[PDB]
Amino acid sequence: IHLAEAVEGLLLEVNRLDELFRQGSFLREKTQLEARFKEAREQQLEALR
Amino acid sequence: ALRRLRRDWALHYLNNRFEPLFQRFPQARAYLEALRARLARYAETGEPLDPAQWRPNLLTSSSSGTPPPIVYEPYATAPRLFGRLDYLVDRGVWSTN
Amino acid sequence: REAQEAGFALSTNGERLELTGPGPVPAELSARLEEVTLGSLAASAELEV
Structure with missing residues (x-):
């Protein structure tokens, strides 16, 4: 029964994960990753230009 | 990435x-x-998690051992003896958890 | 308020938010924009529930 309650908490942890993905630090990491990729792409096509 | x-x-x-x-x-x-x-x-791919497919199936409640689990099965049919793996038909497709 | 500090205008196109500025948006400002967008979606869901 304790295992069932713990698993219920773990299944509700999906909302916790979603909120974490809407949190500040994760989104900063995400935007820095996307900024690195976008900078690489921009350097690439400006070298082509 | x-x-x-x-x-x-x-x-x-x-x-x-x-x-x-x-x-x-x-x-x-x-x-x-x-x-x-x-x-x-789920967090990575966004694939939704069915709670009914990952809940632990608590078959029978815990027994104190006094009295012990005493199961008289007057009708020893295959389902009533060994349990049964139920199935759900969704749009004609069989699936169960 | 924190976006015009860096010289950007917060354009609200329906549910979406964008930063219109003379140059590329900063990484942290884009992170904050994505954070408020995800928070607005989560707040709509929370309002429904």
């Missing part, structure tokens, strides 16, 4: 949630690890 980052962040967050449950249920280590992997894969 976004999928990898989401996977890593989810795993790091779920480690602190699963360590107490890893300690409290050392026997359920494999099942809890599988559930953590499923949660991380």
Whole structure:
């Protein structure tokens, strides 16, 4: 029964994960990753230009 | 790489949630690890997690051992003896959990 | 308020938010924009529930 309650908490942890993905630090990491990729792409096509 | 980052962040967050449950249920280590992997894969790929497919099937309630589990089955049919693996038909497709 | 500090205008196109500025948006400002967008979606869901 304790295992069932713990698993219920773990299944509700999906909302916790979603909120974490809407949190500040994760989104900063995400935007820095996307900024690195976008900078690489921009350097690439400006070298082509 | 976004999928990898989401996977890593989810795993790091779920480690602190699963360590107490890893300690409290050392026997359920494999099942809890599988559930953590499923949660991380949901976090990465966005694949929805069916709670009914990952709930632990508590077959019968715990017995105190006094009196012991005394099961008189007057009709020894295959389903009533060994249980039965129920099935659900969704749009003509058979599936169960 | 924190976006015009860096010289950007917060354009609200329906549910979506964008930063219109003379140059590329900063990484942290884009992170904040994504954070408020995800928070607005989560707040709509929370209002429904």
